[PDB]
Amino acid sequence: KKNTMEMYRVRLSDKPHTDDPILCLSLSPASDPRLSHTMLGEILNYYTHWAGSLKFTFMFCGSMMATGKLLVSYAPPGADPPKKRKEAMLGTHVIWDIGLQSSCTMVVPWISNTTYRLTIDDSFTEGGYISVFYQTRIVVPLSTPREMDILGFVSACNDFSVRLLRDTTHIE
Amino acid sequence: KKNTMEMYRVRLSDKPHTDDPILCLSLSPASDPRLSHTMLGEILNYYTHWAGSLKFTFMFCGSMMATGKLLVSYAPPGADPPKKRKEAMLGTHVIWDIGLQSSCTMVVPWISNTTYRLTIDDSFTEGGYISVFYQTRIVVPLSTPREMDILGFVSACNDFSVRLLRDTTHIE
Amino acid sequence: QLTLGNSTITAQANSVVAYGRWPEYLRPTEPEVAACRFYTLDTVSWTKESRGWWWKLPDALRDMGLFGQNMYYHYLGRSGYTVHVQCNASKFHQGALGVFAVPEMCLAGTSYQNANPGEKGGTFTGFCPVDYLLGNGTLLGNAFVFPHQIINLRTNNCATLVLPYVNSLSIDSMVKHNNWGIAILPLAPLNFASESSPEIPITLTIAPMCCEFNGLRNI
Amino acid sequence: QLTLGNSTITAQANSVVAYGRWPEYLRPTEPEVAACRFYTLDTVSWTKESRGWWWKLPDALRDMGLFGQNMYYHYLGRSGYTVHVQCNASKFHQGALGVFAVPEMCLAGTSYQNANPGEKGGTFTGFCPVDYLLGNGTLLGNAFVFPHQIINLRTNNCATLVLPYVNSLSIDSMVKHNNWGIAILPLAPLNFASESSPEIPITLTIAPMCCEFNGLRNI
Amino acid sequence: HRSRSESSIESFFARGACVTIMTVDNPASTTNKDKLFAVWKITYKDTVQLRRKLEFFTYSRFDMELTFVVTANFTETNNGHALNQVYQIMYVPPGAPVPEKWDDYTWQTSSNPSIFYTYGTAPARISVPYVGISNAYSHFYDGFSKSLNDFGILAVRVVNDPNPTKVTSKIRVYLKPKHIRVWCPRPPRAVAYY
Amino acid sequence: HRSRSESSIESFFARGACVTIMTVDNPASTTNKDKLFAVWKITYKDTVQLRRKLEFFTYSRFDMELTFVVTANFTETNNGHALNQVYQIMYVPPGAPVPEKWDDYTWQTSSNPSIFYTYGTAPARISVPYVGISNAYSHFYDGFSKSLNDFGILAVRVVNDPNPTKVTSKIRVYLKPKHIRVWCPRPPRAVAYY
């Protein structure tokens, strides 16, 4: 799927639903391979220190008739990636009723001891996670297709900031 | 005729009049061979950028008895040199009745996308044309000579300007 | 020097407003300078043998750019004119022209290709309309009832006719009906001193006034 | 129902004014209704295999009557736009389009016949610009920097972009330089319930705003 | 309390970086080969870093701040004690004739500014203002003839007369775009495309 | 909005351009030939560019801003390590005696200003004021004796004593007319006439 337009969208099928995340995403931009190309990994790959709050918008590209619920959970830094629906529900979550809403927004807050967290440090791998869980299987009428798509958008918030340009763009 | 005083004047005979311009003149000073020696081609051969409106005065060195009409047409830049009287008449023209006037003045306006058009660029060859057409053959009484003369004068207007001295005057 | 848009003719015999009525807007569109130019038709060389020349309006201006593409791509159209004839001659040429603005000029010696020549105009004869009767079966002497002017080459050399819109219908299709007609006839034949130029040009200059077109035909 | 001259489209997803700047007159001419129509280009049938469609402005409107005959018979020309995409789909169709107004859209996979298709538009590919990189060598994900909109077929089916005149020169020749570029890309492929119509149309509707042309070329 | 005034356009771009290494040499008295005057057309499309940083945007207006670091070396064991080289560094503005010989008039022409540099002193320095016909540089052009903005040329030679030493020299050029404005952001190109 | 303040007289003329290359040399201790003091009469009628630009007008009042670029080279393989040459650059005003020897009194005379230049430092520089009898230079004179305005002379030599090295030198002179006024415009001469 890489190198094509199939990489950007996650398929929400209607079969196993084995109580495991649809998608778990690390909240360390400029270090996460799947989050270091989104114009935050392209600006934080020129800097060394970053300090701000991100913003994840999940859009549901399905039919108006499709109904159900999803669970967007945010494990703060120093925690572990929740691996079951109940644990994610016990944390900081938002229930996203796709039936009556089409996009769910989650603003990851800026929590850290320092005023600026190093962008690419392999020691700090507990920067927090954002995960999506099947609260309820999807219900669709008639022959409406089972397979659906969900898209993610990652943006900086109005209080973002970076420091100490690096400019590691070599060629050889 | 070159290298002499015969170059500066154009003869308006009274024979073929084959609906083709008496004289067609490109409006790109400092690049046109017949317009790059008139003290505008001598000042714009020291500069690189020019931006202004020119001014062409055509004087008719004939007898008071000679009567007729001429047609001074201005094809704006991006057009093509009009090659018949009707097409020139459909454009931006002035009818010059030599009988009751002896000099016709035409101020080519400054039209261009940029604020300054390069002086000598061989890519831009559609800078506009000014042409003279026989609106009506010349009528003279008695044995008045058929051959006559017309002189042209090219001057800058009060809003002319140049930029970026070049000074290409070599010797070797 | 006139001020109508792109075209300007140097004109120094005063205007003869036909029927005492100035062309006025119907009480549509307003072309402003789109068609109200001075369309200087081609010149015709008056000689010692020429018998006349007849143009028809608006058929004459059927290829004159914006006016031609507005009268042909509309359905209803009305417009006066300011026909202006100039005969550039020296002091040693003698003659006289009559310019007649013949409304509903039916030159019945009639195919549409013969009675609507266009910019070329035409030529009377002694399609060969008879000059003697003006082509209308009526003696030329009476032709002076038509709103006219005389260009005598010892007092003037230009004649201006301000033709209003004269038609039974307040607005008519310009591609089928020719409201007016300009007939130029030599009243006194041209003559000149020896060795002078033997053919003096005549230039018409039509300036549609208060033109209004209604309808449209795409393209 | 809009009010722009002859053409009116019935439009019930709000307008996304690109860069927060409304198209404004240069501080020329004023075509008014001469070219400020709603030129509804031909529809393109979105299917389960289509990868994208790219149009370029003003090259798209090179045959649209008065605008096409004004941008080609002038020398300088500037104009914003009000591109308007509508994807008529029922409740049982699912998908999502991204409409990107790509300034200086250089789809370098370049002959002038390949980068200026016109009303036909074009088609990305997986002349075959690569959809994955948007044809610009850059990942499609970042493409959202361009002033864009998203047409998700469960919340809306129309998207309006108000493109101002963006060009290094305050006024440029419309026949050589393509200021903008409209790229429509399926973010989520079309899908539908069985036996439903398998190809939903998409109609663009370009409305030149504040157009100004300077110069002229006769004819 | 944070600032955000380090992601500004000028802060992001106003960083000097070598753009070329122009090689010249003082011809030996044997005249084996004439002066190797080095001519280089000012263009940012040879440095990956500056080009990539400039391709985030469509149009830009940046003033250049060229600077020259001059180094030289004898190619032979014998010293020869060549007196300190004097380098002429001529900035041929956009459109002016391009030098084609080490004795062409363009070196002596009045229009082209020039700097004279004695090997050893502080590095030379000029500041080419915003020199362009349009109202902003363009890195992506969607039009056709009938990008490639011309900034000028730099031509460097050794004024000194031939000396039997073969003193080779390599002028490093550092370009720091200052007073830079940028419009119309675009997706960043991958680092493999250059 | 345009300026027009680039076609001004000073902007058109106030451009430095080499006017001569005066050759001197430090005599060898063998005294094969005495010092080649270089004497050059200041005249603009040897540079095509400046002369042509000045022939657009009849009368002019321009102050000179001479500048000297000094270069040198050993003529022999052996270095000899000649200590940095010291050049005396004497501006002989108009009418003063013209030096005829490398030891003439004119070098030591009080009237003639002189500059002492150690090979290596920043280029020398003077500014000859408007030095003329009349109230404006004249490039075209319609009279007869009973043009050729005298600006002065420049005489350059090497103060150092003879050393067995044969250190040849070539002083390039750059003239930038400043505070220049011009009257009575004339047709420009063709570029083949010079």
PDB file of C-alpha atoms in Angstrom, chain D residues 19 56 103-106 110-112 116 136-138 142 145-146 166-169 176-178, chain E residues 58-59 133-138 140-146 184-190 193:
ATOM      1  CA  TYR D  19      -5.729  32.334   1.477  1.00  0.00           C
ATOM      2  CA  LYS D  56      -5.930  24.437 -15.204  1.00  0.00           C
ATOM      3  CA  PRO D 103      -1.174  27.737  -7.634  1.00  0.00           C
ATOM      4  CA  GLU D 104       1.474  27.356 -10.328  1.00  0.00           C
ATOM      5  CA  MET D 105       0.483  23.706 -10.646  1.00  0.00           C
ATOM      6  CA  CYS D 106       3.448  22.224 -12.523  1.00  0.00           C
ATOM      7  CA  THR D 110       6.368  18.898 -20.709  1.00  0.00           C
ATOM      8  CA  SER D 111       4.932  20.138 -23.995  1.00  0.00           C
ATOM      9  CA  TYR D 112       2.448  23.002 -23.945  1.00  0.00           C
ATOM     10  CA  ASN D 116      -2.682  22.915 -21.007  1.00  0.00           C
ATOM     11  CA  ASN D 136       4.433  17.379  -8.090  1.00  0.00           C
ATOM     12  CA  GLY D 137       6.915  14.866  -6.660  1.00  0.00           C
ATOM     13  CA  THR D 138       5.533  15.499  -3.156  1.00  0.00           C
ATOM     14  CA  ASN D 142       1.003  17.438   2.461  1.00  0.00           C
ATOM     15  CA  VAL D 145      -1.378  23.091   2.402  1.00  0.00           C
ATOM     16  CA  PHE D 146      -2.921  24.227  -0.883  1.00  0.00           C
ATOM     17  CA  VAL D 166      -2.213  34.927  -7.323  1.00  0.00           C
ATOM     18  CA  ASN D 167       0.723  35.701  -9.601  1.00  0.00           C
ATOM     19  CA  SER D 168       4.106  37.371  -9.299  1.00  0.00           C
ATOM     20  CA  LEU D 169       2.925  40.076 -11.726  1.00  0.00           C
ATOM     21  CA  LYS D 176       0.512  31.693 -21.663  1.00  0.00           C
ATOM     22  CA  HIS D 177       0.473  31.535 -17.854  1.00  0.00           C
ATOM     23  CA  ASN D 178      -1.896  29.356 -15.797  1.00  0.00           C
TER      24      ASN D 178
ATOM     25  CA  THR E  58       6.003  29.424  -4.682  1.00  0.00           C
ATOM     26  CA  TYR E  59       7.169  33.057  -4.817  1.00  0.00           C
ATOM     27  CA  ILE E 133      12.113  41.984 -13.550  1.00  0.00           C
ATOM     28  CA  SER E 134       8.994  40.587 -11.881  1.00  0.00           C
ATOM     29  CA  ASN E 135       7.748  41.588  -8.436  1.00  0.00           C
ATOM     30  CA  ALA E 136       8.842  38.308  -6.821  1.00  0.00           C
ATOM     31  CA  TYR E 137      11.046  35.377  -7.723  1.00  0.00           C
ATOM     32  CA  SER E 138       9.220  32.281  -8.947  1.00  0.00           C
ATOM     33  CA  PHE E 140       7.566  27.123 -10.069  1.00  0.00           C
ATOM     34  CA  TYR E 141       6.371  28.552 -13.388  1.00  0.00           C
ATOM     35  CA  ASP E 142       3.206  27.158 -14.971  1.00  0.00           C
ATOM     36  CA  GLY E 143       3.628  29.133 -18.204  1.00  0.00           C
ATOM     37  CA  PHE E 144       5.644  28.592 -21.359  1.00  0.00           C
ATOM     38  CA  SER E 145       8.047  30.617 -23.459  1.00  0.00           C
ATOM     39  CA  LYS E 146       6.313  32.364 -26.352  1.00  0.00           C
ATOM     40  CA  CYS E 184       2.075  30.611  -1.327  1.00  0.00           C
ATOM     41  CA  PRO E 185       3.323  27.633   0.717  1.00  0.00           C
ATOM     42  CA  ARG E 186       3.670  24.301  -1.073  1.00  0.00           C
ATOM     43  CA  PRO E 187       4.268  20.683  -0.069  1.00  0.00           C
ATOM     44  CA  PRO E 188       7.927  19.948   0.692  1.00  0.00           C
ATOM     45  CA  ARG E 189       9.732  17.856  -1.889  1.00  0.00           C
ATOM     46  CA  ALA E 190      11.315  14.617  -0.744  1.00  0.00           C
ATOM     47  CA  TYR E 193      14.341  14.388  -5.432  1.00  0.00           C
TER      48      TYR E 193
END
